[PDB]
């Protein structure tokens, strides 16, 4: 059991308004054949155009919410939707555009699908609330059949070509006039009551109702992602590498130990308390601070309460020393806190929109991440750059260019003149915290923190 049987019902009461008399019995291989398509009985990789939710979670950053709204079914234009904010309007004969004939309306969707997706995934798995009108009209811009490579590359072919009989994969397709092997999955066959507004809304206030398709395509990929990654979670789901993920992670992992050693160093906390992962390892090993660890996982939902996590009655004083809360997204951090939060409003091939202002933050696994709001920080200031090191200065073993910098914290600089291995280290450790910035985590400190404080551990 790993793709989705044609066999399977289909529930069709959700198509009765589009599809009046439509059979309350249905398989999915008898509405691939009403929707016009010919599978031919054909072990060729493609046995479904539907697939099961899990597949579909697997193939999240494939997804695109779709919506059909009839202007005017044959003899009316068509209003297509996408969760890009793209409307296009179809005639037979929150962007809008003006109706147009379906030969040209398909080039525009090719051309859209592969400028979202070629850096995100190898398919497109567009996500319904299926009434009717969807279905009936992808036959006017999906061809499909035996899974295929691309004329120019090695990945799967996602669009094919009637000018000139070829298929291509998202980055090879301009030019190209049909969808080739798309997926798709009707969210009302998970078992919901009433309509697509009424469960959106239950959980997100973001996103609007317009009366647009492209509005409802929105709400659809938004409620999906609800149910597969806010009250649902799922962090063994691993995800391909199609970015940054590995360089963002180190970076991470040196920008934590960077900071936590200097505020140690520079304000000498008795005690350190550790909020968040449950796997967390301590990140400055050697430092001589009391280490305690709180277990708290990845919120997904709403960001947690500071009143649920600190009381109820651990060394009971979180006011003692200093609280790290490192991608531990709270709704107010305390004074005396470290805080690492990432920025859900950022624009990146990681960061897949979300529910309620939240995204979808996809690096080796799926996080879905609490809107980013500014008011948690009230009590702290944001963490200036700087690089601190008490290693010796030695090279060992990329030419040079000498390094002036007020924030290169050695004993070199204190002397008067950055050695090279304090420059090098420098130099990779700013392109390692501006991965970081750029991936969309900040950095937030107590008030008091000040770098002038760590001059006289150089003593
Ligand atoms: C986006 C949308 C449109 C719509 N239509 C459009 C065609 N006339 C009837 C109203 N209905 C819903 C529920 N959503
Ligand atoms: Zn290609
Ligand atoms: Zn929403
Ligand atoms: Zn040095």
Same mark, same amino acid.
């Given at each position: 059991?790993?793709?989705?049987?044609?066999?399977?019902?289909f529930?069709?009461?959700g198509?009765?308004?589009?599809?009046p008399?439509?059979?309350?019995?249905?398989?999915?291989?008898?509405?691939?054949?009403?929707?016009?398509?010919?599978?031919?009985?054909?072990?060729?990789?493609?046995?479904?155009?539907?697939?099961?939710?899990?597949?579909?979670?697997?193939?999240?950053?494939?997804?695109?919410?779709?919506?059909?709204?009839?202007?005017?079914?044959?003899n009316?234009?068509?209003?297509?939707?996408?969760?890009?904010?793209?409307?296009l309007?179809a005639?037979?004969?929150?962007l809008?555009?003006?109706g147009?004939?379906?030969?040209?309306?398909?080039?525009?969707?090719?051309?859209?699908?592969? +400028?979202?997706?070629?850096?995100?995934?190898?398919?497109?798995?567009?996500?319904?609330?299926?009434?009717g009108?969807?279905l009936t009209?992808?036959?006017?811009?999906?061809?499909?059949?035996?899974?295929?490579?691309?004329?120019?590359?090695?990945?799967?072919?996602?669009?094919?070509?009637?000018?000139?009989?070829?298929?291509?994969?998202?980055?090879?397709?301009?030019?190209?006039?049909?969808?080739?092997?798309?997926?798709?999955?009707?969210?009302?066959?998970?078992?919901?009551t009433?309509?697509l507004q009424?469960?959106?809304?239950?959980?997100?206030?973001?996103?609007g109702?317009?009366?647009?398709a492209?509005?409802?395509?929105?709400?659809?990929?938004?409620?999906?992602?609800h149910?597969?990654?806010?009250?649902?979670?799922?962090?063994?789901?691993?995800?391909?590498?199609?970015?940054?993920?590995?360089?963002?992670?180190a970076?991470?992992?040196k920008?934590?130990?960077?900071?936590?050693?200097?505020?140690?160093?520079?304000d000498?906390?008795?005690?350190?308390?550790?909020?968040?992962?449950?796997?967390?390892?301590?990140?400055?090993?050697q430092?001589?601070?009391?280490?305690?660890?709180?277990?708290?996982?990845?919120?997904?939902?709403?960001?947690?309460?500071?009143?649920?996590?600190?009381?109820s009655?651990?060394?009971?004083?979180?006011?003692?020393?200093?609280?790290?809360?490192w991608?531990?997204?709270?709704?107010?951090?305390?004074?005396?806190?470290?805080?690492?939060?990432?920025?859900?409003?950022?624009?990146?091939?990681?960061?897949?929109?979300?529910?309620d202002?939240?995204?979808?933050?996809?690096?080796?696994?799926?996080?879905?991440?609490?809107?980013?709001?500014?008011?948690?920080?009230?009590?702290?200031?944001?963490?200036?750059?700087?690089?601190?090191?008490?290693?010796?200065?030695?090279?060992?073993g990329?030419?040079?260019?000498?390094?002036?910098?007020?924030?290169?914290?050695?004993?070199?600089?204190?002397?008067?003149?950055?050695?090279?291995?304090?420059?090098?280290?420098?130099?990779?450790?700013? +392109?390692?915290?501006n991965?970081?910035?750029?991936?969309?985590?900040?950095?937030?400190?107590?008030?008091?923190?000040?770098?002038?404080?760590?001059?006289?551990?150089?003593?």
């Amino acid at each position: 059991p790993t793709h989705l049987s044609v066999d399977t019902k289909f529930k069709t009461e959700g198509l009765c308004v589009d599809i009046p008399g439509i059979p309350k019995d249905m398989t999915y291989r008898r509405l691939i054949s009403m929707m016009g398509f010919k599978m031919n009985y054909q072990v060729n990789g493609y046995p479904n155009m539907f697939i099961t939710r899990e597949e579909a979670i697997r193939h999240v950053r494939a997804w695109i919410g779709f919506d059909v709204e009839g202007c005017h079914g044959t003899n009316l234009p068509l209003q297509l939707g996408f969760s890009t904010g793209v409307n296009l309007v179809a005639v037979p004969t929150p962007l809008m555009y003006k109706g147009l004939p379906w030969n040209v309306v398909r080039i525009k969707i090719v051309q859209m699908l592969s +400028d979202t997706l070629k850096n995100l995934s190898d398919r497109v798995v567009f996500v319904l609330w299926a009434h009717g009108f969807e279905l009936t009209s992808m036959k006017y811009f999906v061809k499909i059949g035996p899974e295929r490579t691309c004329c120019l590359c090695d990945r799967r072919a996602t669009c094919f070509s009637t000018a000139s009989d070829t298929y291509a994969c998202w980055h090879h397709s301009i030019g190209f006039d049909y969808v080739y092997n798309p997926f798709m999955i009707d969210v009302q066959q998970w078992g919901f009551t009433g309509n697509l507004q009424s469960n959106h809304d239950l959980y997100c206030q973001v996103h609007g109702n317009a009366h647009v398709a492209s509005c409802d395509a929105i709400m659809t990929r938004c409620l999906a992602v609800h149910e597969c990654f806010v009250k649902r979670v799922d962090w063994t789901i691993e995800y391909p590498i199609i970015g940054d993920e590995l360089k963002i992670n180190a970076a991470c992992r040196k920008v934590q130990h960077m900071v936590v050693k200097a505020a140690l160093l520079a304000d000498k906390f008795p005690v350190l308390h550790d909020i968040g992962n449950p796997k967390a390892i301590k990140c400055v090993p050697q430092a001589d601070v009391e280490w305690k660890f709180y277990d708290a996982q990845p919120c997904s939902d709403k960001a947690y309460k500071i009143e649920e996590l600190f009381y109820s009655y651990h060394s009971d004083k979180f006011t003692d020393g200093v609280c790290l809360f490192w991608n531990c997204n709270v709704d107010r951090y305390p004074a005396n806190s470290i805080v690492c939060r990432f920025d859900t409003r950022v624009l990146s091939n990681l960061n897949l929109p979300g529910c309620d202002g939240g995204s979808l933050y996809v690096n080796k696994h799926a996080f879905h991440t609490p809107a980013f709001d500014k008011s948690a920080f009230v009590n702290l200031k944001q963490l200036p750059f700087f690089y601190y090191s008490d290693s010796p200065c030695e090279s060992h073993g990329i030419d040079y260019v000498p390094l002036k910098s007020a924030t290169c914290i050695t004993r070199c600089n204190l002397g008067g003149a950055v050695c090279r291995h304090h420059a090098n280290e420098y130099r990779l450790y700013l +392109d390692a915290y501006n991965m970081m910035i750029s991936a969309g985590f900040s950095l937030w400190v107590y008030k008091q923190f000040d770098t002038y404080n760590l001059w006289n551990t150089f003593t």
